[PDB]
Structure 1
Amino acid sequence: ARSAYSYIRDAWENPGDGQLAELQWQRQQEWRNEGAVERIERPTRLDKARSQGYKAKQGVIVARVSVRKGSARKRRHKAGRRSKRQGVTRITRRKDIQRVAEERASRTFPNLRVLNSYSVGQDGRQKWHEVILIDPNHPAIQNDDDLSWICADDQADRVFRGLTGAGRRNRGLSGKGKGSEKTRPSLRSNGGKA
């Protein structure tokens, strides 16, 4: 039959209805007084967490990250700029809020590397995402077949190179077909046209 996890996963399909909504309205209050990068002891979304790589092991860390809601906090051009490049309000970044979160976090925990991330709500002026990090210098993980690879040197500061899962999704590398002409194998080797 259905696992206990499948309940949590279903509840989160509509975070505005039922018990979860009654929960969000509560926590969020306590969440708004909390700092930007806070280390929590256990995943809010246990299912998603596990389904992303989570494990109750030594060297596996989770954390919530709050970011201001909005569009390009872009300063207006000071020198001569033609009508088209005269934007400040409308234009938005080419990097999604979730990815910004992953970085603020990886930085906060220098030595740790980023496994994955996931949304955990949002109100009228901020969005929250939890982050799974791993300590690639801890024998538990160096010995764990299922996470071992994250220790590889060429995995260091991966979130910053866009190597996340949320990264490749942002880079337009989902479909192996139509549309990916300008994105595979990388944006820079395609002249940045996506």
Structure 2
Amino acid sequence: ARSAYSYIRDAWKNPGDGQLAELQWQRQQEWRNEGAVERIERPTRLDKARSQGYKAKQGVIVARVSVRKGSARKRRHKAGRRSKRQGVTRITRRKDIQRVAEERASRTFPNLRVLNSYSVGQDGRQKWHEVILIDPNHPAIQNDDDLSWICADDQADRVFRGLTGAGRRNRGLSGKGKGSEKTRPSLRSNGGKG
């Protein structure tokens, strides 16, 4: 039958209706007063967490990040940068907020590696994401048959090289066919036209 999990999930399908609506209105007040990276004992969205790879083990950390909202905060132009080149309040950046989050998080934890992240709400001027990080040095995880992969030296700073799932989903790598000619196998490998 339905798993208790499928309930948490089925609820966040519309974080603005019912109990969850009352929760967020409350939590946020507390959230809005927390740092920019708060570690938390348990994931707010359990289904999602586990689903994304979470495990109630040793070395599996969760942290809620809070990034300022908006689009782009771009200066005008020092020298003589023409019209098509005067970006300031009408353009946005090529990296989505969740990626910014994942990064700030991994920095706060200079030894942990990003596993994944999820949204947990957003008031009128900031977005919150919980990021699942992992200690590649705790044997507790070095042994785990489902997570020991995140230990390869070539997984170091995996988030800063866009290896997160959201990382890849942003580098235009979702589709295996049409419209991904300039993305895969690498944006840089494609003279950045993706």
Compute the TM-score of the two structures, normalised by the length of structure 1: 0.99
Q: Give the 3-state SS of the residue equivalent to 2:65 in structure 1.
A: strand
Equivalent-residue separation in structure 1 for 2:47 and 2:124 (angstroms): 26
Q: Give the 3-state SS of the residue equivalent to 1:74 in structure 2.
A: coil
Report Cα offsets for 1:83-142 as digits up to 9, x if no partner. 101121011000000000000000000000000000000010000000000000000110
Are 1:4 and 2:1 counterparts? Answer: no
Q: How many residues align?
A: 194
Equivalent-residue separation in structure 2 for 1:172 and 1:134 (angstroms): 26
Report Cα offsets for 1:55-100 as digits up to 9, x if no partner. 0000000000000001211111010011101121011000000000
For residue 151 of structure 2, what is the aligned residue in structure 1?
Answer: 151
Unaligned runs of at least 5 residues, structure 1: none
Equivalent-residue separation in structure 1 for 2:133 and 2:100 (angstroms): 15
Q: Give the 3-state SS of the residue equivalent to 2:120 in structure 1.
A: strand
Q: Give the 3-state SS of the residue equivalent to 1:41 in structure 2.
A: coil
Deviation, structure 1 residue 34? 0.3
Deviation, structure 1 residue 51? 0.3
Deviation, structure 1 residue 180? 0.4
CA RMSD of aligned residues (A): 0.5
For residue 161 of structure 2, what is the aligned residue in structure 1?
Answer: 161
Q: Give the 3-state SS of the residue equivalent to 1:43 in structure 2.
A: coil
Equivalent-residue separation in structure 1 for 2:86 and 2:102 (angstroms): 30
Runs of 4+ displaced beyond 3 Å: none
Q: Percent identical across equivalent pairs?
A: 99
Equivalent-residue separation in structure 1 for 2:26 and 2:32 (angstroms): 11
Equivalent-residue separation in structure 2 for 1:63 and 1:193 (angstroms): 34
Deviation, structure 1 residue 18? 0.2
Deviation, structure 1 residue 20? 0.1
Deviation, structure 1 residue 166? 0.4
For residue 177 of structure 1, what is the aligned residue in structure 2?
Answer: 177
Compute the TM-score of the two structures, normalised by the length of structure 2: 0.99
Equivalent-residue separation in structure 2 for 1:103 and 1:76 (angstroms): 26
Unaligned runs of at least 5 residues, structure 2: none
Are 1:69 and 2:69 counterparts? Answer: yes
